[PDB]
Motif scaffolding. Structure first.
Motif, PDB file in Angstrom:
ATOM      1  N   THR A   4       0.832  -1.229   0.000  1.00 19.08           N
ATOM      2  CA  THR A   4       0.000   0.000   0.000  1.00 19.08           C
ATOM      3  C   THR A   4       0.849   1.255   0.000  1.00 19.08           C
ATOM      4  N   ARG A   5       0.300   2.397  -0.444  1.00 26.64           N
ATOM      5  CA  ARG A   5       1.051   3.626  -0.671  1.00 26.64           C
ATOM      6  C   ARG A   5       1.665   4.178   0.615  1.00 26.64           C
ATOM      7  N   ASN A   6       0.992   4.046   1.753  1.00 29.25           N
ATOM      8  CA  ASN A   6       1.459   4.211   3.148  1.00 29.25           C
ATOM      9  C   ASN A   6       1.963   5.601   3.586  1.00 29.25           C
ATOM     10  N   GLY A   7       2.559   6.377   2.698  1.00 27.71           N
ATOM     11  CA  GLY A   7       3.243   7.618   3.020  1.00 27.71           C
ATOM     12  C   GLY A   7       4.643   7.356   3.554  1.00 27.71           C
ATOM     13  N   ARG A   8       5.454   8.394   3.591  1.00 28.43           N
ATOM     14  CA  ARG A   8       6.852   8.318   4.034  1.00 28.43           C
ATOM     15  C   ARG A   8       7.445   9.626   4.557  1.00 28.43           C
ATOM     16  N   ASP A   9       6.679  10.709   4.672  1.00 29.64           N
ATOM     17  CA  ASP A   9       7.156  12.023   5.088  1.00 29.64           C
ATOM     18  C   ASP A   9       6.915  12.331   6.574  1.00 29.64           C
ATOM     19  N   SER A  10       7.890  12.949   7.224  1.00 26.81           N
ATOM     20  CA  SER A  10       7.851  13.432   8.615  1.00 26.81           C
ATOM     21  C   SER A  10       7.743  12.344   9.690  1.00 26.81           C
ATOM     22  N   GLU A  11       8.024  12.723  10.935  1.00 24.90           N
ATOM     23  CA  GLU A  11       7.817  11.914  12.145  1.00 24.90           C
ATOM     24  C   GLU A  11       7.061  12.681  13.244  1.00 24.90           C
ATOM     25  N   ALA A  12       7.031  14.017  13.174  1.00 22.87           N
ATOM     26  CA  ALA A  12       6.316  14.945  14.056  1.00 22.87           C
ATOM     27  C   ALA A  12       6.407  14.588  15.556  1.00 22.87           C
ATOM     28  N   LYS A  13       7.618  14.292  16.013  1.00 24.73           N
ATOM     29  CA  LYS A  13       7.942  13.738  17.336  1.00 24.73           C
ATOM     30  C   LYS A  13       8.747  14.707  18.189  1.00 24.73           C
ATOM     31  N   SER A  24      18.275  32.620  21.598  1.00 28.77           N
ATOM     32  CA  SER A  24      17.589  33.630  20.773  1.00 28.77           C
ATOM     33  C   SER A  24      16.171  33.234  20.436  1.00 28.77           C
ATOM     34  N   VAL A  25      15.913  31.934  20.324  1.00 31.65           N
ATOM     35  CA  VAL A  25      14.601  31.357  20.129  1.00 31.65           C
ATOM     36  C   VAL A  25      14.454  30.148  21.040  1.00 31.65           C
ATOM     37  N   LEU A  26      13.331  30.069  21.722  1.00 30.14           N
ATOM     38  CA  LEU A  26      12.875  28.893  22.437  1.00 30.14           C
ATOM     39  C   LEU A  26      11.684  28.357  21.663  1.00 30.14           C
ATOM     40  N   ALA A  27      11.767  27.098  21.231  1.00 29.36           N
ATOM     41  CA  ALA A  27      10.783  26.441  20.387  1.00 29.36           C
ATOM     42  C   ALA A  27      10.298  25.094  20.932  1.00 29.36           C
ATOM     43  N   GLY A  28      11.064  24.404  21.785  1.00 28.32           N
ATOM     44  CA  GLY A  28      10.660  23.156  22.427  1.00 28.32           C
ATOM     45  C   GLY A  28      10.563  22.002  21.428  1.00 28.32           C
ATOM     46  N   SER A  29       9.381  21.443  21.275  1.00 34.43           N
ATOM     47  CA  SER A  29       9.056  20.428  20.269  1.00 34.43           C
ATOM     48  C   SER A  29       8.066  20.967  19.237  1.00 34.43           C
ATOM     49  N   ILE A  30       8.216  20.536  17.984  1.00 34.27           N
ATOM     50  CA  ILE A  30       7.423  20.978  16.835  1.00 34.27           C
ATOM     51  C   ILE A  30       6.570  19.803  16.381  1.00 34.27           C
ATOM     52  N   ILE A  31       5.379  19.673  16.932  1.00 29.67           N
ATOM     53  CA  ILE A  31       4.551  18.480  16.782  1.00 29.67           C
ATOM     54  C   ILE A  31       3.136  18.787  16.299  1.00 29.67           C
ATOM     55  N   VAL A  32       2.668  17.984  15.347  1.00 30.28           N
ATOM     56  CA  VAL A  32       1.311  18.043  14.809  1.00 30.28           C
ATOM     57  C   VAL A  32       0.283  17.693  15.864  1.00 30.28           C
ATOM     58  N   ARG A  33      -0.966  18.074  15.605  1.00 28.07           N
ATOM     59  CA  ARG A  33      -2.182  17.686  16.310  1.00 28.07           C
ATOM     60  C   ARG A  33      -2.314  18.135  17.779  1.00 28.07           C
ATOM     61  N   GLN A  34      -1.247  18.136  18.562  1.00 26.55           N
ATOM     62  CA  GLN A  34      -1.242  18.433  20.004  1.00 26.55           C
ATOM     63  C   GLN A  34      -1.713  19.868  20.297  1.00 26.55           C
ATOM     64  N   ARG A  35      -2.864  20.000  20.930  1.00 23.07           N
ATOM     65  CA  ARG A  35      -3.533  21.262  21.351  1.00 23.07           C
ATOM     66  C   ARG A  35      -4.387  21.072  22.609  1.00 23.07           C
ATOM     67  N   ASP A  50       1.379  26.688  13.529  1.00 25.41           N
ATOM     68  CA  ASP A  50       2.686  26.746  14.179  1.00 25.41           C
ATOM     69  C   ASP A  50       3.298  25.462  14.759  1.00 25.41           C
ATOM     70  N   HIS A  51       2.527  24.609  15.401  1.00 20.20           N
ATOM     71  CA  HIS A  51       2.950  23.340  16.022  1.00 20.20           C
ATOM     72  C   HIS A  51       4.068  23.430  17.065  1.00 20.20           C
ATOM     73  N   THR A  52       4.476  24.632  17.441  1.00 20.51           N
ATOM     74  CA  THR A  52       5.700  24.924  18.182  1.00 20.51           C
ATOM     75  C   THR A  52       5.389  25.393  19.615  1.00 20.51           C
ATOM     76  N   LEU A  53       6.392  25.534  20.476  1.00 13.18           N
ATOM     77  CA  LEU A  53       6.298  26.109  21.821  1.00 13.18           C
ATOM     78  C   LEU A  53       7.041  27.445  21.905  1.00 13.18           C
ATOM     79  N   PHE A  54       6.773  28.361  20.970  1.00 18.07           N
ATOM     80  CA  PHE A  54       7.491  29.616  20.856  1.00 18.07           C
ATOM     81  C   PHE A  54       7.338  30.512  22.100  1.00 18.07           C
TER      82      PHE A  54
END
Lengths: 79, 58
Positions: A4-13, A24-35, A50-54
RNA sequence: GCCUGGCGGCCGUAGCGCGGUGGUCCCACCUGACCCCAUGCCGAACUCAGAAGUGAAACGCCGUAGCGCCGAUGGUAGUGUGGGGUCUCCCCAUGCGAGAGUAGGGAACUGCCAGGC
RNA sequence: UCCUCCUAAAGAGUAACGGAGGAGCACGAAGGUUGGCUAAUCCUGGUCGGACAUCAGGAGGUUAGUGCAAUGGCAUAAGCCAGCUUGACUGCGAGCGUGACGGCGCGAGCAGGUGCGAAAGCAGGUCAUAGUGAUCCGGUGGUUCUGAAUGGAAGGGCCAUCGCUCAACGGAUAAAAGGUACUCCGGGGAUAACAGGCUGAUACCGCCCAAGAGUUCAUAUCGACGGCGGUGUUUGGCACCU
RNA sequence: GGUUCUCCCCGAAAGCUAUUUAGGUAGCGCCUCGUGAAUUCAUCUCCGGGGGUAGAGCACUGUUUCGGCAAGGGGGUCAUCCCGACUUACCAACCCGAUGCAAACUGCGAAUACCGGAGAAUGUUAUCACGGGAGACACACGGCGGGUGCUAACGUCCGUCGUGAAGAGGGAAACAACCCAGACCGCCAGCUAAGGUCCCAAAGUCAUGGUUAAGUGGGAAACGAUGUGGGAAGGCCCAGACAGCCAGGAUGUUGGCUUAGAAGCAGCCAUCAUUUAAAGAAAGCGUAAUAGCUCACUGGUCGAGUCGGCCUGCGCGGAAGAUGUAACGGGGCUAAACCAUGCACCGAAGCUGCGGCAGCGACGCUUAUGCGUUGUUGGGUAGGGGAGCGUUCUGUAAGCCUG
RNA sequence: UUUUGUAUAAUGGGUCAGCGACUUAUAUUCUGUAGCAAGGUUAACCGAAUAGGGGAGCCGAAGGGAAACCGAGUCUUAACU
């Protein structure tokens, strides 16, 4: 049923772990979906997009487990 | 407490890298090296982690 | 000490069931509605002016160890590393160790300010 | 070629025609922002209404809604409306995250010009993750860049404007399709066939066991069902040594 | 495919990403030499942090068994008078009481891992950048974590630990990868490991304890047998058991119920009282039924343990195949079988002592630089790097040696 | 010799002998080494052909920008930020 095609991009971890900051920048983790699992508190912002902890000011993260029912916080404080 | 005399019986050659790192942290060489290690709980916990192949004397 | 309100903190010890309880104080109903304000229509909502009525609903406190919730000790599930075997399991050495229940805990605790006794 | 989840291991990576679904865009509005509000579903009850068009109340739920995959978000609403509105902003940028790069997301900071609001604050697009075609280049408008004897100028550049399912998608050239048991070349059990091994589902047989047949009776003789083996040994599986 | 004489220093891969890509090559991972500046790292304990696998579970999703109630839909029927009613094998909402499954679910969630502090202990020249070279991107295997396959293959597809790849030695008959241990080089030297000690073939037929009874050990299943030791109860048990031998087998009794009849003699009621040297309304074969009996149950005798199961171990029968014993290496065999602990002996390239060699450091003694004590790396293919010995040429070489 | 791996029933070898393989050609650069140094170097040729001349030409010390143009600055730019 093939391929199956499955996908192969990103890990968002996680990346930002333990006691952390940002020179100069605090960003933490850059993760999808988490809100709705862990929330920003103090100088830190997100919840776009954004997905970030700016951070809008200078300070360091300690993480919090205390809060109303299911809420837990990614707390930032100056030194 | 009294310090503990350590000897290696068996060798660590077949054992996992974490345990080889314990034998190295204990300072052990050529299966016996005339070593006597500190009277701390921290070193007792390091001996306990490999006790099937480290010999102890007090 | 005690009573309450706001910001809240902690967020179930803060829950549920059932009972008790307050109007000096605060709080809600309540008593009215020009003007500023509001209505695809409306003083319904939002909003203003207040004290004749009440402690009901609403708001807040509390008894009650019955259940929830938290859960020791012992054992169990599982498991890191090692030796074997009767081999996806068992036996041994040496450490870790839930989930559920028990006894015990528990019908919270508190920072700042303000009003009241 | 693009997107998501699980297998996938209390980081990520991580194989199987392992398990399953989507994209190669659309909205000037479904963007922006300020103000107001929020379901489903059932029951009760009433005209103009043929069987049913009304909405008010209770019972009750974040079990309604959102451009679509699955994942996750969302009522502080991104859901439903009311107004005002066009920030679906320009040129840029410390820095962070990310893939080997192409490419890309996040973002402090500066000027300019807009919009909502009392102000704070937000606005360089939609609820996020898919909606393309580089390099090469033909045509065209601009150009106080240049065109080598001088001055113009075909031409070259810069700045606007558009397009190759080249989709074999990261694209071998203004221009390229089929066949060889008539061939034929380099390599090989890395790879099949006739044979060697491994396995014994298949194959033939026995034993535990017994719905039944054997005019009675299951088991003399024979056996549907379920079970456990005897064999190397065939039909297949398999791709080691050839 | 052919690719060269001699001592050394460091030491890979068969992975990622792309390609008319799956035989090559190119950015990332892995190897290495120089240059400049320099400690590189983990294990142990606790604290904090992001954490949902293992296990646990039924709340929610989907699925599900069992029991009961059951809206509405799908199917069938009879009434149309009884308040319309029976039915739910099907599809499915509500609900009371329980139970199985889950990668795709969660009224719970480890061990371990990973990141960083607070702290102790040990020892490797390290890490980093720049400047130069690579090698590989078709490996194979044992175990573990999971799918796949027939809970098959020396089958398949991965993750993941270690080994063969590039690892020699002791052990597994002979064996790569499994077991013991990682080899600088020696010692007519010691000490151990796995394994081993009747003989082949070096060493205990060792000391002591445990178990089986057989060529078990030395191929082997489901299945089957008073093969049998141990464990906890129960029964019979020493004024007297189980088995044997001999001697006893009725009186109430012609029992009552059902039925096809049934004197114990296929069902049901029961299963006692009595006598004695002594006894079932019945145990089995048997008959039309009794009977025949062989027994159940007592007496005498002998004599002390024993009967049926439960539980836990070890054995037996279960057991046919092909060149020749041919499924312990072979022989032997009563332990000279297996098993545990103890001390021996035999056991490696391991450990110790002693003797040699290369690199770099250290302690002490001693002195036109020697002697003691020592830390410590020394298995290496791809590949990177350093240094030796021979061969030959030119000069020295019309010098110097020589018939 | 082939291969992850062969005592191998995987290719090879009767044996002795004469033989048989990583270079120099050119450009640039890295390293080494040296001369000179903000400079270095010559080629062809001339010439006393291993001297001396020949610096044509090349390499280097200044950058920014398509380029016009500007220069210890410059392109982007209204810009200072």
């Amino acid at each position: 049923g093939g391929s199956t095609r499955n996908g192969r991009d990103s890990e968002a971890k996680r990346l930002g772990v333990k006691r952390f900051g940002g020179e100069s920048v605090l960003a933490g983790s850059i993760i999808v979906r988490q809100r709705g699992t862990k929330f920003h508190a103090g100088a830190n912002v997100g919840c776009g997009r954004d997905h970030t902890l700016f951070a809008k000011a200078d300070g360091k993260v300690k993480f919090e487990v205390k809060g109303p029912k299911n809420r837990k916080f990614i707390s930032i404080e100056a030194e | 407490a009294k310090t503990i005399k350590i000897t290696q019986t068996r060798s660590a050659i077949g054992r996992l890298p974490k345990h080889k790192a314990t034998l190295l942290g204990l300072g052990l060489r050529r299966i016996g090296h005339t070593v006597e290690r500190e009277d701390t709980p921290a070193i007792r916990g390091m001996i306990n982690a490999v006790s099937f192949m480290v010999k102890v004397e007090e």
